[PDB]
A paper describes a structure:
Avian influenza A virus H7N9 causes severe human infections with >30% fatality. Cryo-EM structures reveal that H7.HK1 and H7.HK2 bind to a β14-centered surface and disrupt the 220-loop that makes hydrophobic contacts with sialic acid on an adjacent protomer, thereby blocking viral entry.
We froze grids containing the Fab:HA complexes and determined cryo-EM structures of each Fab bound to an H7 HA trimer. A resolution of 3.62 Å for H7.HK1 and 3.69 Å for H7.HK2 was achieved. The epitope of H7.HK2 is similar to that of H7.HK1, only differing in slight contacts on the periphery. In addition, nearly all hydrogen bonds are conserved between the two antibodies. However, the substitution of F56S in CDR L2 of H7.HK2 results in an additional hydrogen bond with HA G129. This substitution also shifts the orientation of H7.HK2 CDR L2 slightly so that Y49 interacts with T165 for H7.HK2 instead of Q163 for H7.HK1. The light chains of both H7.HK1 and H7.HK2 are glycosylated in CDR L1; this glycan plays no role in binding, but there is good density to support its presence. However, the HA 220-loop (G218-G228), which makes hydrophobic contacts with sialic acid has no density present in the structure of H7.HK1 or H7.HK2 bound to HA, suggesting that these antibody binding causes the 220-loop to become disordered. There are three mutations in the binding site of H7.HK1 and H7.HK2—namely, A122T/P, S128N, and R172K, appeared in 2016–2017 compared to the 2013 H7N9, and all three mutations are located at one side edge of the epitopes, thus not altering the mAb interactions with HA1.
Author numbering:
A (entry chain A): 1 to 119
B (entry chain I): 35 to 208, 220 to 316, 323 to 441
C (entry chain B): 1 to 111
D (entry chain C): 390 to 441
E (entry chain C): 292 to 316, 323 to 338
């Protein structure tokens, strides 16, 4: 039973590079490969893309050039970096693992890192 | 005939299992904790090494040992299974490591409480890396209906696996057997269990090309490790042996003969071309020219000379023949048969019959080769005598 | 990109009744193993969701017996035996046969 | 080649084929070598008979 | 190879010397009192 936890800046101006981080316990990014997802304000849940613990990445074709996921194997946390942030990128980022990749144990959605574009 | 009764393997990587077994090093028993994730070109498995601590045997066993000889070491890739909603620790009294400790890289999947239902978790893993994956799993036979009902609950138990090349089904028999599998890249190795399933924790991957050893002598790295046998290391340029027909590595050809000596020198008569025993009656000692010579005796200038011109060409011919034949082949034999745990009797009889016939033809080839090369050397040296005479 | 269609939209269900929500795909969902790759997550409003059904039609670990969504081919239907207080949730139908891992518009179930 | 045999009989077959490969390769090397020597002797012997 | 087939070897190409010894410009007196050959034959 792993425990997921997310953190990052909330009030963020548009266009510049976004920072995000996410801490996990138990598996320690040593066995299963996690991923990131994006939930626009009360809209349709989207799948950013998966990252192998080894490092191989596979983001959603919809948005690929503006999104990069951090492996961060040594530390027990995986981070997310989004470029070209927009009012459309305003969202409630969730940090998790999913059934269908090979593990059949729930999902352990991490807490929502609500983000805003403000001015 | 002479062997070095130590595993003399300096310069290339070596692992001494000792009490560890090579079928152990996938499972992770208490005797292989430091060799669970080894990486070397040598495996030394000993007679005293037991591959399991709980009682049981490997199904499809000798083939799996022959694969793990040719591994180059093992890079255990951590399989991403979690097993949520059931108990994971299943340590038994048979294995001793700081008290109760089961295999490190498998898990005895056991119910949370005794005499309860086992959820039918049907696990699955995909080989993302571009390499074949050695996937292992174990099935715990109960031994009685009481232990089955206590551990995994009542009712019949059905465990199945599934791949693109493996869809073969199991049932427990009312004492753990392990069953291996080749997993292709971009393929999925889907399990499906209803209890009595020793679930794996990490996946095995090959590294390179190792060539293993089955012996009882200790390791002492001082030599180059070319060819090995069941009681040490034999290293030589000689193309044939007599010690053991089951030598694994870059090993000479076993013969039935005691010791076939090649007559690398000429025919000698002490005090087949013509006149080897003719007008030149006997050989004479007072001459230092090699494996040929032209000794001299005069009447005015008495003394011994040496015709180096044809002699050195003759020695170059004999030494070129020597370097041609003593040149050993590049073929790499493997360990087909086993001496610690015996193979099935019919396949073993086929193996011994094939091996004995191979030693028959190699021994006859060696005897005929020595005979024809002895005749070649004698006829050659007689031919240089004749061309000197003309 | 596999558009996943959720049926229907909302269920103003009354307490203690069987409630069934379906989700069809324009591509038949069937993994090589034979175990269809499809899930039935449920997001608690303003919070982290929870998977309720996994691997097509299989009771998920730590999930109440009422939830037992079935289905076949390309159309799978999550079913619930009774309606309770915790039932309220926007249900999402995850695919998983291919990448992208598409979800659903959601099903806002309420009393 | 299309669908592999089971591994024990497969390794027995491969070991047998490699051993027969060694036997035929070594016999071919011997045959080539001594038939090259026989051609040399069958070129030289009648030249010696011409000479005498 | 399946059928009435040649015998497999490990060698790249073995060549049988159908011709005699060449000395361009094992039996007794090969290239002896005569030194070398001549192409005009
Ligand atoms: C395995 O599948 C991935 C995804 O389609 C592909 O990129 C990769 O080339 C495949 N592996 C091989 C060996 O073709
Ligand atoms: C094969 O021969 C070895 C020794 O030559 C012997 O120990 C072994 O038992 C034989 N195999 C069988 C199946 O009898
Ligand atoms: C399903 O519909 C979408 C909508 O355009 C299309 O892109 C996709 O290719 C379709 N999939 C199949 C399997 O027809
Ligand atoms: C036998 O050898 C061939 C190549 O020499 C190889 O392709 C085949 O896989 C081997 N058989 C087994 C059972 O490994």
């Amino acid at each position: 039973q792993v425990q997921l936890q997310g953190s990052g800046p909330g009030l963020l101006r548009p266009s510049e590079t976004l920072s995000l981080t996410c801490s996990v316990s138990g598996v320690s990014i040593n066995s299963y490969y996690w991923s990131w997802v994006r939930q626009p304000p009360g809209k349709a849940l989207e799948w950013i893309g998966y990252i192998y613990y080894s490092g191989n990445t596979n983001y959603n074709p919809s948005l690929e050039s503006r999104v990069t996921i951090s492996v961060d194997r040594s530390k027990n946390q995986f981070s997310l970096k989004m470029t070209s942030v927009t009012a459309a990128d305003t969202a409630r980022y969730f940090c998790a693992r999913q059934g269908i990749f090979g593990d059949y144990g729930s999902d352990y959605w991490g807490p929502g890192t609500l983000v805003t574009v403000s001015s | 005939r002479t062997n070095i009764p130590r595993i003399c393997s300096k310069g290339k990587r070596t692992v001494d299992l000792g009490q560890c077994g090579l079928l152990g090093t996938i499972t992770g028993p208490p005797q292989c904790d430091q060799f669970l994730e080894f990486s070397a070109d040598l495996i030394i498995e000993r007679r005293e090494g037991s591959d399991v601590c709980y009682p049981g045997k490997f199904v499809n066993e000798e083939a799996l040992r022959q694969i793990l000889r040719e591994s180059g070491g093992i890079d255990k890739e951590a399989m991403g299974f979690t097993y949520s909603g059931i108990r994971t620790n299943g340590a038994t009294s048979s294995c001793r490591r700081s008290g109760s400790s089961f295999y490190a890289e498998m898990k005895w999947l056991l119910s949370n409480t005794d005499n309860a239902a086992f959820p039918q978790m049907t696990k699955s893993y995909k080989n993302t890396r571009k390499n074949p994956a050695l996937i292992v799993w174990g099935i715990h036979h109960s031994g009685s209906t009481a232990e089955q009902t206590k551990l995994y609950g009542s009712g019949n138990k059905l465990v199945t696996v599934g791949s693109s090349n493996y869809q073969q089904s199991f049932v427990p028999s009312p004492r753990i057997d392990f069953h291996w599998l080749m997993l292709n890249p971009n393929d999925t190795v889907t399990f499906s269990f209803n209890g009595a399933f020793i679930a794996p924790d990490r996946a095995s991957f090959l590294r390179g090309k190792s060539m293993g050893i089955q012996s009882g002598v200790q390791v002492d790295a001082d030599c180059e490790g070319d060819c090995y046998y069941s009681g040490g290391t034999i290293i030589s340029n000689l193309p044939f042996q007599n010690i053991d027909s089951r030598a694994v590595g870059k090993c000479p050809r076993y013969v039935k003969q005691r010791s076939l000596l090649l007559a690398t020198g000429m025919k000698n008569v002490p005090e087949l071309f013509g006149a080897i025993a003719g007008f030149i009656e006997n050989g004479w000692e007072g001459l230092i020219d090699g494996w040929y010579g032209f000794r001299h005796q005069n009447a005015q200038g008495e003394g011994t000379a040496a015709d180096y011109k044809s002699t050195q060409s003759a020695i170059d011919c004999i030494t070129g023949k020597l370097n041609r034949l003593i040149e050993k082949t590049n073929q790499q034999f493997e360990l087909i048969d086993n001496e610690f745990t015996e193979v099935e009797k019919q396949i073993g009889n086929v193996i011994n019959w094939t091996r004995d016939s191979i030693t028959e033809v190699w021994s006859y080839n060696a005897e005929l080769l020595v005979a024809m090369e002895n005749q070649h050397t004698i006829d050659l040296a007689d031919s240089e005598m004749d061309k000197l005479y003309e | 990109d596999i558009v996943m269609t959720q049926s229907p939209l909302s269920l103003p269900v009354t307490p203690g009744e069987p409630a069934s929500i379906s989700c069809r795909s324009n591509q038949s969902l069937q993994h090589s193993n034979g175990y269809v790759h499809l899930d039935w997550y449920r997001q608690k409003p303003g919070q982290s969701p929870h998977l309720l059904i996994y691997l097509g039609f299989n009771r998920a670990s730590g999930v109440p017996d009422r939830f037992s969504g079935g289905g076949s081919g390309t159309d799978f239907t999550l079913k619930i035996s009774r309606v309770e207080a915790e039932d309220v949730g926007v249900y999402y139908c995850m695919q998983g046969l291919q990448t992208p891992f598409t979800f659903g518009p959601g099903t806002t179930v309420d009393l």
